[PDB]
Amino acid sequence: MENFEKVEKIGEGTYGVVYKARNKLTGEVVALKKIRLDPSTAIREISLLKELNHPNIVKLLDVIHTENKLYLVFEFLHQDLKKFMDASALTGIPLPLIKSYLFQLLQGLAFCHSHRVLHRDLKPQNLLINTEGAIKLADFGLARAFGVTLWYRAPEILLGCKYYSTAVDIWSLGCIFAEMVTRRALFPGDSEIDQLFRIFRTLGTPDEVVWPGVTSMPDYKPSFPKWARQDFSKVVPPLDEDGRSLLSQMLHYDPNKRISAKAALAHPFFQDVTKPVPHLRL
Numbered sequence: 001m002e003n004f005e006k007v008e009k010i011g012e013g014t015y016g017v018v019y020k021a022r023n024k025l026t027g028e029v030v031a032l033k034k035i036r037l038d039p040s041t042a043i044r045e046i047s048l049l050k051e052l053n054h055p056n057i058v059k060l061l062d063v064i065h066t067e068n069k070l071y072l073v074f075e076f077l078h079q080d081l082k083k084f085m086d087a088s089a090l091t092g093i094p095l096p097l098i099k100s101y102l103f104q105l106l107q108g109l110a111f112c113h114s115h116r117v118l119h120r121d122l123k124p125q126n127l128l129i130n131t132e133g134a135i136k137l138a139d140f141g142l143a144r145a146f147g148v149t150l151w152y153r154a155p156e157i158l159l160g161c162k163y164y165s166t167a168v169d170i171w172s173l174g175c176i177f178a179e180m181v182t183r184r185a186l187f188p189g190d191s192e193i194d195q196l197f198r199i200f201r202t203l204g205t206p207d208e209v210v211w212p213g214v215t216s217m218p219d220y221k222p223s224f225p226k227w228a229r230q231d232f233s234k235v236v237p238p239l240d241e242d243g244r245s246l247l248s249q250m251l252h253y254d255p256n257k258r259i260s261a262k263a264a265l266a267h268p269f270f271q272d273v274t275k276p277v278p279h280l281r282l
């Protein structure tokens with residue numbers, strides 16, 4: 001590369017290959033994302049995301065459009081939440097650290113949402129951690145500009161609603177919360193219908209009482225099986241009553257009923273939040 005002294009593939013991301021790269025002029029290590037194309041609107045829209053700065057969002061440092069190729073340059077972090085959860089599977093992530101991470105992620109969502117930016121595809125691979133106890137969300141705003149792990153997808157998306165709201169991100173974060181606590185994915189579906197039916201088997205099949213308008217969703221079928229709903233006490237033990245209450249508000253079926261990021265920060269579950277230091281093996 002003409003502007004990067006060295007470049008190493010990290011892995012296959014949601015938009016193309018992601019590289020660890022060293023800027024040739026400055027020496028700075030960045031995450032360089034090559035967008036897999038064959039989009040003038042996307043360039044201007046994403047370029048606006050360069051302006052956003054919060055401690056819990058991965059900075060978009062640059063948008064590079066050269067040689068008819070598109071690259072996004074982001075601030076590099078040394079581990080994602082997926083790998084951290086794997087590394088913590090025998091002990092679990094300590095509760096104070098789960099709580100710190102959830103609090104920080106909600107601050108990042110609240111910031112992004114207040115600026116009219118959604119994620120739409122939050123998942124452990126786009127939640128990145130550092131050695132100082134921070135966690136940051138990567139790739140906020142890209143999905144709208146550009147138009148597969150289904151495990152974190154909100155039910156309205158799975159039911160074919162093409163109108164996204166802030167609530168889709170709260171759903172995904174609720175699923176991630178549950179996974180940090182239990183050390184297993186909450187809804188590890190293998191297809192859209194398996195994903196939907198895993199949700200239904202835990203939370204009950206939605207109906208017009210809990211979710212007015214659900215039966216007019218594009219992909220809703222009156223033939224869906226009708227499962228009863230399970231208690232969160234069975235789903236995320238040993239999470240306490242405060243954590244279970246918050247999770248239940250993040251996982252309401254009706255997106256309009258789900259707690260906002262701002263309201264979630266005020267929940268009693270955060271009546272003793274702290275910022276612990278994680279043990280990261282790099």
Ligand SMILES: Nc1nc(-c2cccc(CC(=O)O)c2)c2nc[nH]c2n1
Pocket residue numbers: 010011012013014015018031058074075076077078079125126128138
């Ligand atoms: N080390 C590192 N890795 C990634 C990364 C690498 C591969 C995949 C993804 C997410 C996905 O494609 O869904 C993210 C970063 N994104 C911003 N900063 C980053 N730093």
